[PDB]
Write a protein that binds this ligand. Sequence first.
Ligand SMILES: CC(C)S(=O)(=O)NC[C@H](C)c1ccc(-c2ccc([C@@H](C)CNS(=O)(=O)C(C)C)cc2)cc1
Ligand SMILES: C=C(C)[C@H]1CN[C@H](C(=O)O)[C@H]1CC(=O)O
Length: 262
Amino acid sequence: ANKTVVVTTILESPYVMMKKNHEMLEGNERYEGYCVDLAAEIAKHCGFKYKLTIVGDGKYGARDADTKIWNGMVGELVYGKADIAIAPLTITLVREEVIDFSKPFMSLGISIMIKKGTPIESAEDLSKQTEIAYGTLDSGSTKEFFRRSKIAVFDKMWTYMRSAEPSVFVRTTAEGVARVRKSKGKYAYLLESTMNEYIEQRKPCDTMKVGGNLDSKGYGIATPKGSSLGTPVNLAVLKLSEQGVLDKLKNKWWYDKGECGS
Ligand SMILES: CC(C)S(=O)(=O)NC[C@H](C)c1ccc(-c2ccc([C@@H](C)CNS(=O)(=O)C(C)C)cc2)cc1
Ligand SMILES: C=C(C)[C@H]1CN[C@H](C(=O)O)[C@H]1CC(=O)O
């Protein structure tokens, strides 16, 4: 018999956040956000009951080089702790080797966030100077993009980033944004275009996404290999795409209540 599906997700705005009064609420109603709405829609279309759970270690999915153990949401799928991950989980080769990804439900690319007024318009711009420091998260797909790259500009940027003092890496999105804002234009934060756009729409409206994206990829819903859930989840993403629901949800959580005008 079918079971209540365990959905692993993560606290990251505007994808998932706890409602302000979550202590007096229970279960799935404790949370709100893009991925909460998406989870609800996927569950509706696939006809399953589910329980939203926040990933234990608060990570996305990387494999320890020594222990070979997978962490984060990917880890929870791999080790049978959860049935599906619904989050801004970037589709990458190393992850798709061990879990199944649906077709992407949101597009994004690595992008540059600057404090307004920063004389930077592209990654090449960053790569040609040191006055304005720049960095990525200390773990995740962006950092890996830089570590792995064979492209000259990106390789130059990685070389700079790994040796820059003090460390140009940050541990959370909030930290990157905060560093940008506090640095009077002396720090630029490399982050997924989706988060960049989100933050750009929030007071005090002092950040800006600049330039084209450095790459082009997507977020996908993840399930363990051979899961019975994989096919219907994928078909559900397809259907929600074609009926305009994904566009509607992104507008809902990104732009509808934007605080920085039009
Ligand atoms: C990791 C990469 C291989 S990738 O991200 O999968 N594709 C690379 C290529 C540049 C690319 C990157 C992103 C997208 C893209 C296009 C659309 C979407 C959403 C809106 C819908 N995805 S869908 O499968 O086309 C749809 C019919 C449900 C999400 C991602 C399409 C192609
Ligand atoms: C927010 C985090 C740490 C996640 C979100 N997507 C990327 C991932 O799935 O690895 C990470 C962001 C990044 O690497 O810039």
